[PDB]
Amino acid sequence: AHSQSLDRLMNPLIDQYLYYLSKTINGSGQNQQTLKFSVAGPSNMAVQGRNYIPGPSYRQQRVSTTVTQNNNSEFAWPGASSWALNGRNSLMNPGPAMASHKEGEDRFFPLSGSLIFGKQGTGRDNVDADKVMITNEEEIKTTNPVATESYGQVATNHQSAQAQAQTGWVQNQGILPGMVWQDRDVYLQGPIWAKIPHTDGNFHPSP
Amino acid sequence: DGVGSSSGNWHCDSQWLGDRVITTSTRTWALPTYNNHLYKQISNSTSGGSSNDNAYFGYSTPWGYFDFNRFHCHFSPRDWQRLINNNWGFRPKRLNFKLFNIQVKEVTDNNGVKTIANNLTSTVQVFTDSDYQLPYVLGSAHEGCLPPFPADVFMIPQYGYLTLNDGSQAVGRSSFYCLEYFPSQMLRTGNNFQFSYEFENVPFHSSYAHSQSLDRLMNPLIDQYLYYLSKTINGSGQNQQTLKFSVAGPSNMAVQGRNYIPGPSYRQQRVSTTVTQNNNSEFAWPGASSWALNGRNSLMNPGPAMASHKEGEDRFFPLSGSLIFGKQGTGRDNVDADKVMITNEEEIKTTNPVATESYGQVATNHQSAQAQAQTGWVQNQGILPGMVWQDRDVYLQGPIWAKIPHTDGNFHPSPLMGGFGMKHPPPQILIKNTPVPADPPTAFNKDKLNSFITQYSTGQVSVEIEWELQKENSKRWNPEIQYTSNYYKSNNVEFAVNTEGVYSEPRPIGTRYLTRNL
Amino acid sequence: DGVGSSSGNWHCDSQWLGDRVITTSTRTWALPTYNNHLYKQISNSTSGGSSNDNAYFGYSTPWGYFDFNRFHCHFSPRDWQRLINNNWGFRPKRLNFKLFNIQVKEVTDNNGVKTIANNLTSTVQVFTDSDYQLPYVLGSAHEGCLPPFPADVFMIPQYGYLTLNDGSQAVGRSSFYCLEYFPSQMLRTGNNFQFSYEFENVPFHSSYAHSQSLDRLMNPLIDQYLYYLSKTINGSGQNQQTLKFSVAGPSNMAVQGRNYIPGPSYRQQRVSTTVTQNNNSEFAWPGASSWALNGRNSLMNPGPAMASHKEGEDRFFPLSGSLIFGKQGTGRDNVDADKVMITNEEEIKTTNPVATESYGQVATNHQSAQAQAQTGWVQNQGILPGMVWQDRDVYLQGPIWAKIPHTDGNFHPSPLMGGFGMKHPPPQILIKNTPVPADPPTAFNKDKLNSFITQYSTGQVSVEIEWELQKENSKRWNPEIQYTSNYYKSNNVEFAVNTEGVYSEPRPIGTRYLTRNL
């Protein structure tokens, strides 16, 4: 597991020799626009320039183990992430490797983003939570985005004197040059290998 | 090899040997004693609290480190120009580092009367993180590199690092590193240090701009043998549908079939230099593009390489899509536009999409007798087979290399801030003044000593790097664009010293001047 | 080899070479001038009187000494863990010691204004007690060893010793040793010292816990071919005696015949951590187990290795049957329970009797028609042929070796405080600043000079030890117990530095994690 995260790789004692836009307004009131810049320093790590960004994503629905927190409706298939192949839909499962949940919210898990084995003697259909074992893909939260979260935000317009800046949520993000990530962990009860399909192309054919 | 003998000479200059350039730089440094000889735990908590996006946990150490990960640490502006105007590419190959003429001084302060003397028997410790076992701090665009001007005497930056954090707290997997738990060379004045490093294979940085764009690669005189849907209606009125096709010809290049498409994107907000055109509100962070990692948001900066703006709209720039350096003497906070220098990523508009624009449009439904065709804007587009692109340019004041994170996967690990990515980049070089205890009590005491003779060291550093050049081989008839100085008279010389003796770099300088076909 | 040349480098780290581990540590020390360059007689009399049990006679010398007889002087916590979780045993083999980068400083104090300068021509004397002719002071669990954290600068402890005493007085056989009457190496800054030592054959320390107990070694499915007396009475009433025998079977394991019995014991008083359960009286010394030597009583501490308590009663501990270290920063006197760390000798309950319990019972009479059978409790039991036992565990903060007293006889000379016993352990290393006279009178005087230039020295020490490992070879199917850090978040990292720069070892760490059959 990584002992440091992608967004925390700098020296917490020195500033960058790079600046960032810190103010677009000089204070409330009419025509108060300006452009103020500041040095990206230890005091504001979130804004620092970085060479590498987190791996790809494909947002999964978030389900809770403490049932009363889930919506009172059937969403196992309706609210599930999926892909289509020649008119047929298949559950995106387990999909891209992503962290199972944010810090501490251990009661949460992606609808079909992790592997779940059955405990000894567990039945075949409609078995309760306590009779199954859900894997926890947490150690990779240092490089891979969280499965039940958005990858981030992007601008969606041209802010101007008349229009305000707008952002939209990135629900699924394909590979971008500069991305870095970890692959799904392997388990004692898990599979070992897989046959890479014989095709013209593929990307990082790790099962 | 003693007190009265120099342990090295001043080597500073470049040699152009055809397909290779050898830069050698010497600077004289100063190293204070950091942290009172202590390793200290730090967090956004010991920093005076903060927001979650800025939370962190780590340690500050009593060590300093050498950093020369910026081009102007090796290239004089004149050399950068020679490089820029005559080669299509370049890359580092070998590196040779030296530390010499060490002088450890002892400071005495009695009744405000301060005095400095040599402490001949004192040592300085040095070691290289050859196995990358310490958190790599270089390549995060940090201050504290060798100064661009040879005459400047600089202070060595203090080393510190970060591990896993949950707010201002540590987690089970958080790592603590003690640099004393590393073998290091000890040297007294009269001793010296040195080592060599081989750059692993890295592709040449493209120091050229394309002389043609991705959408304009055909023969403007011939038609394709391919057709395209040109009419779905025979004219206004009821039930006028049809299907008419036409040959993709010179008259309609936009529609022609193509083998390669523009690189990936991640839309950035567009900001104007002429302030009155911007919205009257604070959108520096709200309207900024970002990514999330375990609940924390980080500014997508500088992000994927994209053109800074459409043709002519030079007053525009991506909110955080380009690098911005400060002009000489510029302050640290809320500095005005005129006191900063914003890089212009324009030359790559021939292959990379514009940062403040959408990648394109895609259909979002099934047009039918009842429904009209609908399209949506692609605000961010990941890699697609067939994509082609250029990487961020590199600058005289910019970074040179970066350490590619050791992970299961990555894609085109070229540092987003620009430069050469490497799994094993030049190793970190750590240095520290060995602590010298003051007089201890004459009765034993188990407590660690906390009373030290105040000291600091100084000496010279030498960095020699061998660069490989990829020379131009163009058959272009007309002259090319070249980086040049201004002919017009002026008060000071560009890239020279002040009347106060202050060296200053008037503007950023990229490498994309020469051209090449696609 | 002069004033401006380092006389050694910083070596600090470990190498795991399969069946061997090589630990190397470097620390930087400080040596004051002890005792005003005088040998002084000391006793409980010059100490301000005392009780007879604390009477003593000896000498304090102007010499200091090096001590690295604690595991954390060589193993980083991470290494201790690697050792602990993967080997069934280990032991030292070779040792290499070094002293270098000596700096002798002279302190001047005129009108309170203190100033420190180098005294280049001054020397420091060093020598090893290779023939064990001096009283061995190491292995008495004394403070003053190399600090566990590499960055800590430590003060060298002062050497002193004791001989025979009769109250505060000496006896004819009392010995006086002068360390100047030993050849010693003299070194000025620029000179260094070093030596090697071979550990004599010592058994591997057992870094495993047994996966079965002495009383549970049979096959739980088969009976023995041995019988036992099961009935001496045929039922209540007059003259109902008989003799009925039964086969010792699975149903009655307590009665089965066995080939080996539990180790020796010496009952300790039982103390509880939840105070309200203890008697309301002072019994720290009164109720303590002890031994007498020539009229003087000494606390039996830590005594024979015995299990700290019965199953589950974790709140209990033997009055002085286990080692207790202080937490970081804990005071010297009457410190509360929460500021100390009490070791738990539990893993050996599979073979060693419980410290706070009786060894067992024995008959004390001849039962007959008139007298009933009687038993008595065995409070202390010496060795018996057939006994089997484990020795005290060793800890990261604990001692490593001890000198086996040179005597006609001894039994299983394994140091009771834990560790490796040796007739010829690592020799004592004595160091001292050679006295430098102040200006003497210009007229001869027979009296020994008593006016000296005040001085102190400082330098580096290196200790490299080669350890032999005995790797695990278990056929156990289920996972083992392993020493691990806590997953849960927290303010500081365990075994790391503070926000004040204070290194601290949160808890004691034994070696018995892996298991092995009996």
DSSP characters over C252-297: GGGGS--S-EEPPEE---EEESSGGGS-SS--TTTT--EEEETTEE
Residue C331 in contact with partner chain B when CB distance is under 8 A? no
Question: Which of A2, A16, A36 is facing B335, going by the closest CB pair?
Answer: A36
The annotation status of C401 as a binding-site residue, yes or no, is no
Chain B residues with CB under 8 Å of A84 CB are none
Query: Nearest Cα to A42, choosing from B403, B142, B302?
Result: B142
Cis-peptide, bond into residue B77, ω within 30° of zero:
no
Residue B467 in contact with partner chain C when CB distance is under 8 A? no
> Is B283 within 8 Å of A32 (Cβ atoms)?
no
Question: Which of B160, B383, B410 is facing A11, going by the closest CB pair?
Answer: B160
Residue C501 in contact with partner chain B when CB distance is under 8 A? yes
The annotation status of B285 as a binding-site residue, yes or no, is yes
- What is d(CA A33, CA A157) in angstroms, rounded to the nearest whole number? 19
CB contact under 8 A, B279 and A23: no
CB contact under 8 A, B299 and A47: yes
Residue B449 in contact with partner chain C when CB distance is under 8 A? yes
Residue B147 in contact with partner chain C when CB distance is under 8 A? no
The C-alpha of C292 sits at a distance from chain B's nearest C-alpha, in angstroms, of: 31
H runs (alpha helix) in A58-205: none
Question: Which of C114, C150, C491 is facing B169, going by the closest CB pair?
Answer: C491
> Is C509 within 8 Å of C396 (Cβ atoms)?
yes
Please report the beta strands in B312-419, taking only residues with DSSP state E, as ranges in sequence order.
316-318, 324-326, 335-336, 340-342, 360-363, 375-378, 380-381, 387-388, 401-403, 409-410
- What is d(CA C331, CA C335) in angstroms, rounded to the nearest whole number? 6
Residue A202 in contact with partner chain B when CB distance is under 8 A? no
Q: In angstroms, what is the resolution?
A: 2.8
Query: Nearest Cα to C206, choosing from C420, C503, C446?
Result: C420
Residue A179 in contact with partner chain B when CB distance is under 8 A? yes
Q: Give the nearest chain B residue to C2 (CA atoms).
A: B2
* Contact residues for B327 (Cβ-Cβ < 8 A; gap 6+): B339, B340, B341, B504, B506
Interface chains of chain C (3 or more CB pairs under 8 Å): B
Question: Which of A22, A41, A141 is facing B284, going by the closest CB pair?
Answer: A22
The annotation status of B486 as a binding-site residue, yes or no, is no
Looking only at the bridges linking them, the beta strands covering B455-471 and B87-110 are: antiparallel
Residue B366 in contact with partner chain A when CB distance is under 8 A? no
CB contact under 8 A, A21 and B284: yes
Query: Nearest Cα to B512, choosing from B268, B401, B349?
Result: B349
CATH number at residue C201: 2.170.30.10
Chain B residues with CB under 8 Å of A26 CB are none
Strand-pair partners of C220: none
Interface of B with C in 25-54 (CB under 8 A): 35-43, 46
Looking only at the bridges linking them, the beta strands covering B113-118 and B158-162 are: unpaired
CB contact under 8 A, B444 and C31: no
Chain B residues with CB under 8 Å of A136 CB are none
Interface chains of chain A (3 or more CB pairs under 8 Å): B
Counted domains in chain B: 1
- The tokens describing C166, both together, are 């009769």
Residue B103 in contact with partner chain A when CB distance is under 8 A? no
CA distances from B288 to B297, B299, B356 (A): 11, 7, 12
Query: Nearest Cα to C33, choosing from C61, C58, C59?
Result: C61
CB contact under 8 A, B276 and A31: yes
- What is d(CA B177, CA B160) in angstroms, rounded to the nearest whole number? 10
- What is d(CA A21, CA B302) in angstroms, rounded to the nearest whole number? 12
CB contact under 8 A, C456 and B434: no
Q: Give the nearest chain C residue to B127 (CA atoms).
A: C10
Interface of B with A in 235-254 (CB under 8 A): none
CB contact under 8 A, A49 and B141: yes
Q: Give the nearest chain B residue to C76 (CA atoms).
A: B181
> Is B160 within 8 Å of A13 (Cβ atoms)?
yes
The C-alpha of B346 sits at a distance from chain C's nearest C-alpha, in angstroms, of: 47
Name the 3-class secondary structure at B222.
coil
The C-alpha of A207 sits at a distance from chain B's nearest C-alpha, in angstroms, of: 13
The C-alpha of C344 sits at a distance from chain B's nearest C-alpha, in angstroms, of: 24
Please report the beta strands in A103-177, taking only residues with DSSP state E, as ranges in sequence order.
108-110, 116-118, 132-134, 152-155, 167-170, 172-173
- What is d(CA A173, CA A68) in angstroms, rounded to the nearest whole number? 31
Chain B residues with CB under 8 Å of A56 CB are 382
- Which among B140, B261, B362 is the top mutation candidate for probing chain A, defined by the most A β-carbons within 10 Å of its own β-carbon? B140
Chain C residues with CB under 8 Å of B2 CB are 2-5
- Residue range of the domain that includes C126: 1-518
- What is d(CA B30, CA B156) in angstroms, rounded to the nearest whole number? 6
Question: Half-sphere exposure (CA, 13 Å, Cβ side) for B78?
Answer: 8
Cis-peptide, bond into residue B302, ω within 30° of zero:
yes
CB contact under 8 A, B121 and C116: no
Residue with tokens 């020279």: B496
- What is d(CA C474, CA C86) in angstroms, rounded to the nearest whole number? 11
Residue A138 in contact with partner chain B when CB distance is under 8 A? no
- What is d(CA A47, CA C185) in angstroms, rounded to the nearest whole number? 60
CB atoms within 10 A of CB B502: 12
CA distances from C407 to C58, C413, C417 (A): 21, 11, 19
Q: Give the nearest chain C residue to B40 (CA atoms).
A: C501
As a dihedral over the C-alpha atoms of residue C319, residue C322, residue C328, residue C332, rounded to 10 degrees, the angle is 40
Rounded to the nearest angstrom, the gap between the alpha carbon of residue B232 and the centroid of all alpha carbons in its chain is 51
Question: Which of B41, B184, B439 is facing C497, going by the closest CB pair?
Answer: B41
Cis-peptide, bond into residue A94, ω within 30° of zero:
yes
**Torsion angles phi and psi, residue C301, rounded to 5:** -150, 125
> Is B24 within 8 Å of B462 (Cβ atoms)?
yes
The C-alpha of B80 sits at a distance from chain A's nearest C-alpha, in angstroms, of: 20
Chain A residues with CB under 8 Å of B391 CB are 177
CB contact under 8 A, A14 and B157: yes
Residue A111 in contact with partner chain B when CB distance is under 8 A? no
Length of chain A: 207
* Contact residues for A185 (Cβ-Cβ < 8 A; gap 6+): A135, A137, A139, A140
As a dihedral over the C-alpha atoms of residue B455, residue B162, residue C24, residue C145, rounded to 10 degrees, the angle is 70
CA distances from A180 to A52, A55, B105, B278, C398 (A): 7, 5, 46, 35, 45
- What is d(CA B280, CA B195) in angstroms, rounded to the nearest whole number? 56
Residue B133 in contact with partner chain C when CB distance is under 8 A? no
Query: Nearest Cα to C156, choosing from C72, C64, C68?
Result: C64
Interface of C with B in 209-238 (CB under 8 A): none
Residue B273 in contact with partner chain A when CB distance is under 8 A? yes
Question: Which of C5, C101, C489 is facing B166, going by the closest CB pair?
Answer: C489
- What is d(CA A108, CA A104) in angstroms, rounded to the nearest whole number? 9
Question: Which of B140, B299, B383 is facing A10, going by the closest CB pair?
Answer: B140
CB contact under 8 A, B36 and C113: no
Q: Give the nearest chain B residue to C106 (CA atoms).
A: B439
Q: Give the nearest chain B residue to C62 (CA atoms).
A: B442
